[PDB]
């Protein structure tokens, strides 16, 4: 994107195997001042944006 009219990719009803995203490439920031970005498996998210 170009940052003037930023969109919101709403993730629909599905399953987001976060470990699959962590198996692709190393991450740089990975800084989450919220839910722990390690045990992101056994808790359920209502909607992601």
């Amino acid at each position: 994107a170009s940052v003037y009219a930023w969109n919101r990719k709403r993730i629909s009803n599905c399953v987001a195997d976060y470990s699959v995203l962590y198996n692709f490439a190393p991450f740089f920031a990975f800084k989450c001042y919220g839910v722990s970005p390690t045990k992101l498996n056994d808790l359920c998210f209502t909607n992601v944006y």
Partner: protein, 48 residues
């Protein structure tokens, strides 16, 4: 103290919160831990 060397992108990831390849597969630091971390330049001395 233990001998160690890792990426300059992950040299700032020495805190025991960056759980991943550095932590779950290389070395994990416990939460109830006391100790220091020191480092210096080792890029030009050893490189290919």
């Amino acid at each position: 103290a233990d001998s160690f060397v890792i990426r300059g992108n992950e040299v700032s990831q020495i805190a025991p919160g960056q759980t991943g390849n550095i932590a779950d597969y290389n070395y994990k630091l416990p939460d109830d831990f006391t100790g220091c971390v020191i480092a210096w330049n080792s890029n030009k001395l050893d490189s290919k």
